[model samples]
Target: GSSGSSGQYELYMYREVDTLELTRQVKEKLAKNGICQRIFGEKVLGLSQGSVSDMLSRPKPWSKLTQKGREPFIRMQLWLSDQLGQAVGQQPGASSGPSSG
Candidate 1:
């Protein structure tokens, strides 16, 4: 039995996603992939094209969002996770073929 040793347990909520950072990252993904907002919204987020547009245009900080408000963003977070998983499957290397002669 230990009497003097104290072990404190700290619980950190890792779901604290930064909304602004997420928006910026998602914007790049859309631009890089030429993703259509309408399609992505309807299929992935279940939000309208305009809703997706507005959300991306003006993202609320995660701390300020109500549970309902956070739903779409949570969807975006998971979708981005999947996208990253798929994208990272590619090998990392620049095209190597021709050299200056």
Candidate 2:
């Protein structure tokens, strides 16, 4: 670990769970799966038809405590972590996917 690292997550903090990037990234990914914002609200977020759009409109919709988007924010973090090959709640060397030997 000598002089070999990236600064992308140099200031990373666990449980911060407050980033517009995750919201947008997750939104775009779900959209590709044919799950538009409307369907995502009911089938995913359990939000009212009207509130669905409102949730998506915010930059930090889930940052507030006791908000409906808490689940999404957590999920979004997990999804992003996996996508970036940095899944949480696993052993240090376990995230490299299935073992070869």
Model 2 residue 49 CA deviation (Å) reads 2.1
RMSD of 2: 13.6
Model 1 scores worst on lDDT over the 10 consecutive residues at: 4-13
Show model 1 residue runs off by greater than 4 Å. Answer: 1-14, 84-101
TM-score for all models, in order of appearance: 0.63, 0.48
Clashing pairs in 1: none
Q: How large is the C-alpha RMSD of every model relative to the true structure? A: 12.7, 13.6
lDDT of 2 at 54: 64
True lDDT of residue 92, candidate 2: 26
Question: Once superposed on the true structure, which residue ranges of model 2 sit more than 4 Å away at CA?
Answer: 1-14, 59-63, 67-69, 75-101
Give the count of colliding residue pairs in each prediction. Answer: 0, 0
Error of 2 at 71 (Å): 3.6
Question: Considering only N, C-alpha and C atoms within 3 Å, which residue pairs clash in candidate 2?
Answer: none
